[PDB]
Amino acid sequence: GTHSHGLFKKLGIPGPTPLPFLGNILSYHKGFCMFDMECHKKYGKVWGFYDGQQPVLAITDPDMIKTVLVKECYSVFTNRRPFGPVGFMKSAISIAEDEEWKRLRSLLSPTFTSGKLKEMVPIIAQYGDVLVRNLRREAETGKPVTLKDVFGAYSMDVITSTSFGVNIDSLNNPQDPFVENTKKLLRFDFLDPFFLSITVFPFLIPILEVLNICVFPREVTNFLRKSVKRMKESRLERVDFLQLMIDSQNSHKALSDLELVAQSIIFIFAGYETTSSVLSFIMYELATHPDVQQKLQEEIDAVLPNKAPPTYDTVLQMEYLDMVVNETLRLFPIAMRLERVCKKDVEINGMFIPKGVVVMIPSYALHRDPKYWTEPEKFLPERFSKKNKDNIDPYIYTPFGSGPRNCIGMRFALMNMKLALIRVLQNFSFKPCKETQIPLKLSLGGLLQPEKPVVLKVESRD
Ligand code: HEM
Ligand SMILES: CC(=O)[C@H]1CC[C@H]2[C@@H]3CCC4=CC(=O)CC[C@]4(C)[C@H]3CC[C@]12C
């Protein structure tokens, strides 16, 4: 079982020595992120490894990265690594490929313009208020609060309302069937037995498609499909993603009906647990660095006096806030990696890359690389002080990727998280208990998350 295993020794590329059938996956005991640093540390600029039989080429040079992510994105590095039995979700933009990806992407971009984002701020700012009362209510009771729980509820509230115009406080209405289903849409752990099996036996993926076994829980997708077509149905009696999409069905185009339901499902999958994880990582950093939390609270109260409500304009005004957000994303880029399938023999910047190879950018590692980042391990928001910008390479730092296929939901996710932080920090402060793990521990699994969940105390500023 060493078919594609000769490739990198042939081209003269360095790397860890692959076992038959398994390749290098046994090196994943430490998790993706620490496998990526070790390889960087030990082979340097470039290296090669095998996910089962699948050869993966890591690159860390910013010029090489740009060529891949930007310059030719369209005729060579268009698609992501196929990853599992996927059924109708093959039409979701993050999963679609080549020409149909390109069609969806430009059908869906107008939905993410800045105009639309502003129509949406009074809708998401509403759940900023909701989150606050939920927070005071169980902070004036004492004591430890689980962030992932309060920020998950907030992330859900904001998705349900901007995706579908469904307005519920999910923390307190925990069983609207709409809360129950959408909550099951978590990010995939690719070190789970199921995905490691799939990686070693990818010839099994088609078999699973046949039995209609899918990585998106068929019971949840059923629910949303029936939900959506009913929403479209009883709407022929503003503003939300569903609506913007229903409109771009009225004149590549003819954004399909089922194509629409797929995008709706995938927007949830993309924004729900991502947004809640980052908010947790940030609020963890703010509790462990009162320096920074105090400075932010002071910045907020100068832009928004008398606990005044955040607007779009006052949000972009706050550059210490922006500093904290980015410095958190550096330390914890929850994507971990960026990947493109190389779909033709190509020659980029002097390195020959044979057709079929997965080219991989180790985002977690580059964000912690001693060259570009002084004291890489410490939470230092001053890195992003507008002084030191332009000392920041947009290809080293890539928490939302880069190029035509970057995070289409970026400015939304950024605006979402900031409005949440502001409303929270206008009202509360967050101290570390010692149910709190200090310092933080990342998971040995395939998701960038804390080992044990983050718990803190929440004091009302009154
Ligand atoms: C803090 C929250 C988020 C982070 C850190 C994040 C990060 C990322 C990253 C790294 C990628 C891959 C980009 C690449 O391959 O270069 C991505 C893709 C994507 N994200 Fe986000 N994301 C977040 C939230 C969201 C939200 C809220 C949405 C939608 C509402 C969203 C929708 C997408 C979509 C649709 C793609 C694939 C786009 C395509 O393939 O054309 N993400 N995200
Ligand atoms: C947590 C996670 O990544 C999810 C995504 C796809 C999910 C799997 C999908 C297929 C599946 C079918 C089963 O009957 C057992 C559970 C499993 C094996 C699921 C376990 C949890 C997985 C691995």
UniProtKB/Swiss-Prot annotation:
Chimeric transcripts, characterized by CYP3A43 exon 1 joined at canonical splice sites to distinct sets of CYP3A4 exons, have been detected. All are possibly produced by trans-splicing. The chimeric transcripts exist in 3 different combinations: CYP3A43 exon 1 joined in frame to CYP3A4 exons 2-13, CYP3A43 exon 1 joined in frame to CYP3A4 exons 4-13 and CYP3A43 exon 1 joined in frame to CYP3A4 exon 7-13. The longest chimeric isoform (CYP3A43 exon 1 joined to CYP3A4 exons 2-13) exhibits 6-beta-hydroxylase activity, while a shorter isoform (CYP3A43 exon 1 joined to CYP3A4 exons 4-13) does not. Its EC number is 1.14.14.1, 1.14.14.56, 1.14.14.73, 1.14.14.55. This is Cytochrome P450 3A4. Changing T328M: In allele CYP3A4*11; unstable form. Changing D149H: In allele CYP3A4*10. Signal peptide: none annotated. Induction: By drugs, such as rifampicin. It catalyses: an organic molecule + reduced [NADPH--hemoprotein reductase] + O2 = an alcohol + oxidized [NADPH--hemoprotein reductase] + H2O + H(+); 17beta-estradiol + reduced [NADPH--hemoprotein reductase] + O2 = 2-hydroxy-17beta-estradiol + oxidized [NADPH--hemoprotein reductase] + H2O + H(+); 17beta-estradiol + reduced [NADPH--hemoprotein reductase] + O2 = 4-hydroxy-17beta-estradiol + oxidized [NADPH--hemoprotein reductase] + H2O + H(+); 17beta-estradiol + reduced [NADPH--hemoprotein reductase] + O2 = 16alpha,17beta-estriol + oxidized [NADPH--hemoprotein reductase] + H2O + H(+). It is found in: Endoplasmic reticulum membrane; Microsome membrane. Polyubiquitinated in the presence of AMFR and UBE2G1 and also STUB1/CHIP and UBE2D1 (in vitro). Expressed in prostate and liver. According to some authors, it is not expressed in brain. According to others, weak levels of expression are measured in some brain locations. Also expressed in epithelium of the small intestine and large intestine, bile duct, nasal mucosa, kidney, adrenal cortex, epithelium of the gastric mucosa with intestinal metaplasia, gallbladder, intercalated ducts of the pancreas, chief cells of the parathyroid and the corpus luteum of the ovary (at protein level). The gene is CYP3A4. InterPro entries: Cyt_P450, Cyt_P450_CS, Cyt_P450_E_CYP3A, Cyt_P450_E_grp-II, Cyt_P450_sf, Cytochrome_P450_3A. Belongs to the cytochrome P450 family. The lineage of its organism: Eukaryota, Metazoa, Chordata, Craniata, Vertebrata. A cytochrome P450 monooxygenase involved in the metabolism of sterols, steroid hormones, retinoids and fatty acids. Mechanistically, uses molecular oxygen inserting one oxygen atom into a substrate, and reducing the second into a water molecule, with two electrons provided by NADPH via cytochrome P450 reductase (NADPH--hemoprotein reductase). Catalyzes the hydroxylation of carbon-hydrogen bonds. Keywords: Disease variant, Endoplasmic reticulum, Fatty acid metabolism, Heme, Iron, Lipid biosynthesis, Lipid metabolism, Membrane, Metal-binding, Microsome, Monooxygenase, Oxidoreductase, Steroid biosynthesis, Steroid metabolism, Sterol metabolism, Transmembrane, Transmembrane helix, Ubl conjugation. Interacts with PGRMC1; the interaction requires PGRMC1 homodimerization.
